[PDB]
Amino acid sequence: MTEYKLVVVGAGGVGKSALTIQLIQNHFVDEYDPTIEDSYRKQVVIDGETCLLDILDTAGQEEYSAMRDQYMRTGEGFLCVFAINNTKSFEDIHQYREQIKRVKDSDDVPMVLVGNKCDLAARTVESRQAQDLARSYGIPYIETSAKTRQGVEDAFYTLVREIRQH
Ligand SMILES: Nc1nc2c(ncn2[C@@H]2O[C@H](COP(=O)(O)OP(=O)(O)NP(=O)(O)O)[C@@H](O)[C@H]2O)c(=O)[nH]1
Numbered sequence: 001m002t003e004y005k006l007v008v009v010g011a012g013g014v015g016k017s018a019l020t021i022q023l024i025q026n027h028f029v030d031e032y033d034p035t036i037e038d039s040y041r042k043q044v045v046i047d048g049e050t051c052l053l054d055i056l057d058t059a060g061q062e063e064y065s066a067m068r069d070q071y072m073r074t075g076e077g078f079l080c081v082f083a084i085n086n087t088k089s090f091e092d093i094h095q096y097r098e099q100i101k102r103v104k105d106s107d108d109v110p111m112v113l114v115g116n117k118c119d120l121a122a123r124t125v126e127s128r129q130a131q132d133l134a135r136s137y138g139i140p141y142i143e144t145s146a147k148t149r150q151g152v153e154d155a156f157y158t159l160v161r162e163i164r165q166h
């Protein structure tokens with residue numbers, strides 16, 4: 001079976017884990033539980049292909065940046081997550097993307113841009129701004145809510161679609 005190696009990155013608190021746990025476990029983690037590095041595996045069907053998703057859920061914290069340089073090397077594709085209610089997380093995307101391109105030594109790494117927490121009324125990042133950013137990177141954009149599960153599969157599965165195309 002094809003194994004797709006997905007890495008979830010971005011600022012602390014954006015919902016990297018909630019996205020991942022919503023995908024793998026079908027449960028929304030309401031809790032505060034900062035990550036160091038966690039890994040997940042789950043068989044899924046994507047466009048009719050039964051495949052395995054290996055997900056590496058990374059810390060958002062700066063403290064673990066050097067840990068990200070090492071353990072993201074074997075990622076095949078990256079979810080760059082921000083929260084639509086947190087403009088700083090959106091600004092920080094640039095730095096996570098650059099790190100990934102460094103780690104893979106490539107300007108064209110399979111990647112998606114993910115605007116999470118779409119369930120929240122207090123949006124500070126307009127959808128068109130993020131769409132535009134994703135266009136400027138040549139990557140897909142997905143809006144999600146880890147809380148309601150909206151877009152959760154779309155975010156991971158669209159990344160798998162990116163991997164397949166590279
Ligand atoms: N309303 C709402 N809350 C969310 C969503 N995603 C995550 N959260 C909440 O935001 C907080 C942080 O989420 P978490 O998944 O821990 O973020 P992270 O990006 O994995 N944090 P870290 O970088 O420390 O590992 C948690 O209380 C979580 O329930 C969402 O889509 N909607």
Ligand SMILES: [Mg+2]
Nearest residue numbers: 016017034035
């Ligand atoms: Mg986490």
